[PDB]
Amino acid sequence: GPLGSMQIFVKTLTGKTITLEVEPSDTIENVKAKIQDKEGIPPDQQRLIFAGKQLEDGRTLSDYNIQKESTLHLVLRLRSSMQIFVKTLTGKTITLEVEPSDTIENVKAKIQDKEGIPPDQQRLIFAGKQLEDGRTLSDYNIQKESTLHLVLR
């Protein structure tokens, strides 16, 4: 429309500040939708915090007195993560950052990142049992600081 637009700033947990073109008329869900395009996050995982409070999707920027050049905080809905350890027969220990819902495949992918071993050549063992690519860490009750074993194939 003819009023133009204004700039607000979404600050993130890294220190970065991302810039959006908006109007005071706009809702919080619209703003999350714009954030989706500009950095690649769906609305449902993001919380916008301003002047302390989490902002509700149905209220407007103007209702929150969110003015020209204001700063929102983008914070993500919390995921569970943990560290696990992968022992190789060489005796080296690889430390992975994982989620309980990670597939064994995802895990072999993180092992590749560290070791350059393609997932195809990896067999993983926990509690004496071979781990299947399509199951999850939680399916094998793999929990924080659990130790797996890597054998090549």
Partner: protein, 191 residues
């Protein structure tokens, strides 16, 4: 009773080193016994107290980032990828071992560097040689957050309120408050 107390143990470590204070988180039955991501606790931190490193592809560029750090400083230190699983640990210099240490919990910690500022076998564990490092989603990085008095207090309050209530209430508490929650007992100690 408190299986997932990594956050409390890290925060106690930072408080001991920086504030000369032991913390005791006085919880009742019925708390969230879950892994806590500290990230949101640091949203209010000044920008100069949060720094992203992109050096973990190669031993020498990490050693260099580490060797820049002031050995009296303590950091909350996040490893992992930008979109994905992240793990927080405390980074401090233990003069007794002459090296940087990563402390995640009482059961998971390691010496990162030796007396001559080079990575140990465990410190080499931090490296991710076969993937890319940076600020974009899916890249590996390290996030260093100064464990200033203010960040230690925010982390402590965040965890306390998260466990006794939920994440939303903890974010809101940390926005309104800058002093240790009254139910987090502090006792002075030598440093």
């Amino acid at each position: 009773f408190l299986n997932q107390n990594c956050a409390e143990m890290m925060i106690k470590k930072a408080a001991q080193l920086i504030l000369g204070s032991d913390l005791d988180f006085e919880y009742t039955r019925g708390i969230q016994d879950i892994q806590v991501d500290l990230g949101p606790a640091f949203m209010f931190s000044p920008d100069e107290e949060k720094t992203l490193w992109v050096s973990g592809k190669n031993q020498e560029t990490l050693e260099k980032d580490l060797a820049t750090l002031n050995k009296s400083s303590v950091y909350f230190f996040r490893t992992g990828t930008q979109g994905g699983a992240g793990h927080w640990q405390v980074l401090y210099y233990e003069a007794a071992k002459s090296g940087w240490v990563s402390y995640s919990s009482q059961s998971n910690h390691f010496q990162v560097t030796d007396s001559n500022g080079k990575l140990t076998a465990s410190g080499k564990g931090l490296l991710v040689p076969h993937a890319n490092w940076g600020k974009e989603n899916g890249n590996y990085a390290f996030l260093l957050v100064n464990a200033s008095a203010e960040n230690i207090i925010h982390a402590a309050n965040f965890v306390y309120i998260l466990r006794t209530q939920n994440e939303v209430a903890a974010i809101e508490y940390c926005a309104l408050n800058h002093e240790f929650h009254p139910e987090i007992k502090r006792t002075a100690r030598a440093k």
